[model samples]
Target: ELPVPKPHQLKWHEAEMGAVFHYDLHVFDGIRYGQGNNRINPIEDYNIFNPTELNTDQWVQAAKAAGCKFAVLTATHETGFGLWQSDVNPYCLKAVKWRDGKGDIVRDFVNSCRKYGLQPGIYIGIRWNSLLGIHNFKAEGEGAFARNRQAWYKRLCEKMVTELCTRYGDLYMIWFDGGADDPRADGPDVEPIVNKYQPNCLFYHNIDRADFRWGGSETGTVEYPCWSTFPVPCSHHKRIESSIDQLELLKHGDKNGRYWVPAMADTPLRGANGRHEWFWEPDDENNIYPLNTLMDKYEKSVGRNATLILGLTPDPTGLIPAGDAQRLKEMGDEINRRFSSPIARISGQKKSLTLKLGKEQSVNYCIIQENIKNGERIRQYQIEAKVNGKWQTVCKGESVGHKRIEKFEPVEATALRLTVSESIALPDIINFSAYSVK
Candidate 1:
């Protein structure tokens, strides 16, 4: 059975790319962040959390310039210091002196997204809380005392989810970092709260369900032909998935699966130069990925039909850093320069579609968008072009979901043909277009 997407998942695929802003108390501490240490040790001074020049508008503008359709803020990353002014959790912006204890970056970020017309999402890390001595969602020690804290922790997580969902208006998605592992056990039942509050919003996974799956690596790219289906609802159901190659499965999805969970490829913006840091560090501006590398990632991640989310780290000053912002603008400008226009195009529902370029012209890139509301109907397909009065196959692929971007060696053709070799239903081709991306 083929899995069809509801409106929100469809919107996510259409969004194509997103940006995640990671901010934590450790960012302002002026020390290089290590996740292992950061997870176990709490920041001594919460007042270090002050963003002297905090500007969510600047952050959103930078993301918008990079063509990101949605922006996610780390409301509470691994450090467990909430970014918002939390009532349930005492360790948050309320504890800081910024804005005289009136800071709520979450509200600021959501409003910024609305102001800029980009969807906003929130990321909550519930697995590790260093201050509470909770590692991986479990309270320390054993017996009655341990059980009580564990129970309280679970409720705290639920209330926190409720607080976020209720206060944020309508979030595009709610991401629980590292799967919120406790729920699969005797942990928080936060799923029902989100379902009740934000029914259409994407839930990025725990043990129960995931609207999307993480692409195999943090390299910001999925393997070619990454399908938009999974054998199960949640990719983190490890016990049920141990028999299969999880990385391969996550990278290249299952075509015959029953769920419509797509892939999301993520990497930190400062991933270049022998570093893959997700948090800002002093003198780390040099680690910003080069424009060439960013473009390559676009081709592999977005072009492969997987949504790409680049992690953006705001410096202690609350700015997206000048170098990173400049790079984002350049990336956005370059994408528009290469793909904003097409040489020849056609649109409609058909088993096979053709584009008559009218005259022999060189083409290297082609994008195929499926009317995926009818479901991911096309399974196998090939692109052919007329060369010397003969139809020659130029590109062939699997899993044409929301879109399939094909880049081939430049070929001169007077006409192009897309023939669906295999599918479950009539191919719902929305837009078939060609480009000679220079």
Candidate 2:
């Protein structure tokens, strides 16, 4: 039998769209984040961590306006700056001069998410902690001393996970930016901690297991026929083969694979203007993706049966910039305008399903969704419209895991037919709808 999604995984797929708010100490410095340099040099002033008008409610509101069903906060990015108060990690919000050294962005973010009916998640970046002098999960030294420090660092990470898992009421996901590494080989066994505390939370990957996998890149688009299954249990790099294009497998999942490891398409909102940044940078408003580009990305990612999570950067003023927020709103409204209604809709569990429009109607788009909890069964399919007395193939595709959006030239159609040429089992389409949009 094929692997099926867990309850949380089902929620993730149903959500379709989510947002990740990336905020860190580097945002306050007004300098472009240097990944290599950030991993080695700590910020000189922790007091720079002040958000004058910090309003997580406004942040979550912006995401909600963009049709995001869930929201995430980078509780700790590369700077190793914990957004919440932590006793174990001395270099966190408690160390800052903001709010009299008592501000908790994580709490605020979670509260806002709950208040707005959006699930809350957290992204933890533990691979590089400049303040701790840790690079790639190492203590930057040799001998027994280094070994001892490595052990201590692993424990520190475990404690951090524990705090995050327990303190927050209930997180929908705990995304490990980088693989938590292999615990059998000096990697912090944070997986167990997440499992123990957040039994239902989505664990985005450690070497041992991955509830979901990265869809190869940060372009916010997954290749066509992206599967929700993989040959292996985890999405760890070391565990995959090095002979082939590793990213290809991640981009288009293994259709006949065993594990139900779905792909997540991610991208930074500030990827325009020849720049791709996750942290807020000065005068980067132009970098916000335009509505058309965003629509294209939406069509490629969520429309191709893969989930999309965009990185939303919040400025030092502690709010999603007006331009980005308005863009997001525009993207959401455009998506709603395009797909919220249909000229004709139908649902079935047969090889062929048809929808009859009362009379000839113009249709340029079709949306299909599978009852995926039973597993991805559709293999090959095509949509045909009855145009001017003849049937014309509008679109053809393979692999319909959660959803697939098909677009074609507007044609006058009295009826639409879905032909499933191939499938592993009885096809169970939950929704099939058609649209005609300008």
Candidate 3:
């Protein structure tokens, strides 16, 4: 069995669910979609990107209420707007009217995360810069200026990423959006600074040494049997040049592959308005996905050994909308209510265990959790029950990571058994539960 590539990978896997706060100058302009070619307008200035009631605490509070272990902020996006004051770039909050241009949204965000006991993450887009674009490069000098500007772009990337790593005490994750095609997209450019400041931080998207990969869709759902391995001839900078199939990669990861790039399922809290509207829209209040739907997503993503990154849009008031907040709280409550109690639990290594019910009981759901501190090891397992004096297989699954919840037809049995058929190491069972969902 191949060992988990990185220690921080397992740490992120165990987190199970995280929150992505998507807010930028685009929110102020009612633009939710577009990174490069689709942007509604050229990036706006910092002066027009003020949030009257900007409150980072409320954002973290909502994530905590939703039971998220970590939260990510859009520190910088294609709009070329920087949440923190940066001397390296002119298009930063330094020019904004908020707090007399001294406001540091990123600082407030990270502080809020620490206060709420949630890990902090940051996302920075490398494309569609309103201030630093090809047009600007051409105006600076002809072909002579172009070469120098490209070099400047590289420096800009390093400065922004370095600032993020050093400013925040330590980051749980750093996302590189729209940098895959750049000639300097290699992980080493940013990995050194990341390691220097946040040694355990995991980098996502682009770069040959990414810790994780996108789950293919933004619908917050991952296909079943999502393997953590994949086969790739080589990591290239071009989209069509890659050998991997996008759909197959998303649904079923390559079992006989080279890397351990696990999938991350990301989608908005509500899907009614469309995928582009990632930020809070008053019109989308009535369309928030219900609590039951979120539960199903949990079963599909985290239950299948993939991470779920739920998108959250903070309102103009810098707080989650009341309707979305209520839904998230209720969703967290449902998860607690469902898995709070278990018929039985096992700790540390074990091959098999027999669960003897006080009496014959009907069960429709069974949950299994691996001690992921050592990384996901269980490859295959079977759940059996003694019915009519004979043991029968009730359900079977593969790749039990943080948690695996299986649902099947109701079965009445007095005795149940969990059999571990395959594993990399002694499978450390953290939890085993049976639930009768009525």
Candidate 4:
């Protein structure tokens, strides 16, 4: 039997694509990682945390105009710099001169999301910290010192999560980039706070307690037949390093797996050279991926049964880079232009349906959508084009949840046939369309 998805998970899968804004102190110095010793400078770095025109609306607006359903802000990264004013830690923007130490980027971000009708989410990386020597916990333990530091870190995590979950008006998701070294020890500490404040919130990378799994790469691509079930690794926070083809596991999950873990493909919008700095750089404007490339990424990730998360960086002026903004708009416009209308479509029951375009029209893509309101029931399907008075197999795939887009070489045909080869029950298809991207 197909697993029943939670309401939030269904909405998440429907989102298809979202934007991840990467910023903070690290953007100011244009630094990617910390020192060779895995440490960064002190909280005084907040001195340079000010953005001249830090308009949170612009970030959310750009994402919306880019056809994204949600936007996630890096409220806190490895540098331990919190975007919001946090009483739990002194190393936050509250200590900065920004907005006279009263500015709350997270608050502004969430408000902007609500204003523009975008689902708001935040990413918090708990691995590296500047204030506490928790990063040094990996070294040979020193009796009580190690134990005390670990306890301190756990307390800090609880307080930070509590504040975020409580202050925000029901977050769409809370991404825990890296979690406590021992989930057996740390999961219990943080799980309760999340369950208390944000009961419906989706937690990512919080040990085996996560709602979903990362797509294993920053390239925004997932292999075909990507099942939504997989085995959980021992170290939940760290990247999977086992020789059991972890990447494959991330791309194509195990069918008979123990847990239902969907994949989320994350990558930066700035391609090639621009990727050098996840944060905006003045000279990297030309490195932005073209609209066509982004469309391809959408096809490979979102089209392949995974959520595509494009990283967006705001410039020093606290606005999306001009070139990036233009590309985003173009991508959104192109998507609407291409899919706004379909040559033919079909919905409702029956094992087979045919689309008669009236004339032999060129089609390169077929958009399939299962009525997930009922549940993901479709197991396998095939598409055939009526060519030369006979039907020829054009595409085949499995697992259609909410939406599934398939692209094939342009085929000129007046009629197309869709056959449901396998399914748990009589499939409930809500949409089926044959369209051309050109």
Local distance difference test values of all predictions, in order: 0.88, 0.89, 0.73, 0.76
Superior candidate under TM-score, 2 versus 4: 2
| Residue lDDT tens for model 1, 65-107 | 9999999998988777888888999988888788888889999
Highest lDDT scorer: 2
Model 3 ranges off by over 4 Å:
30-40, 134-142, 179-188, 231-243, 273-276, 373-376
For model 3, give the RMSD to the true fold. Answer: 3.2
* Pairs in clash, predicted candidate 1: none
- Each model's total of backbone clashes: 0, 0, 0, 0
Q: Of the candidates numbered 1 and 2, which has the greater lDDT value? A: 2
Query: What would you estimate as the lDDT of candidate 1?
Result: 0.88
- lDDT at 215, model 1: 94
For residue 365, model 1's alpha carbon misses the true position, in angstroms, by 1.0
What residue runs in model 4 are displaced by over 4 Å at the alpha carbon? 30-44, 136-141, 179-181, 186-188, 231-243, 274-276, 373-375
Mind giving the per-residue lDDT tens digits that candidate 3 earns over 1-438? Answer: 554557777767878889999877766655445554434356644455767887888888887777789999988776677889788876788887778889888999999999999999998866556656533112134576767676777677788888888877888899866443334532226667777888889866554456766776887777867777655421223432366566767566665566677777877887653433567755677777878778888888877777888889987666788788888888788878877776655555876767776678787778888776555667788999878778999999876767788888888887778888987678888887777776
* TM-score of candidate 1 to 2 decimals: 0.97
Residue 292's lDDT within candidate 4 is 73
Candidates 2 and 3: which is better by TM-score?
2
Candidate 4 residue 147 C-alpha distance from true site, Å: 0.4
Where model 1 places Cα greater than 4 Å from the true spot, the runs are: 182-186
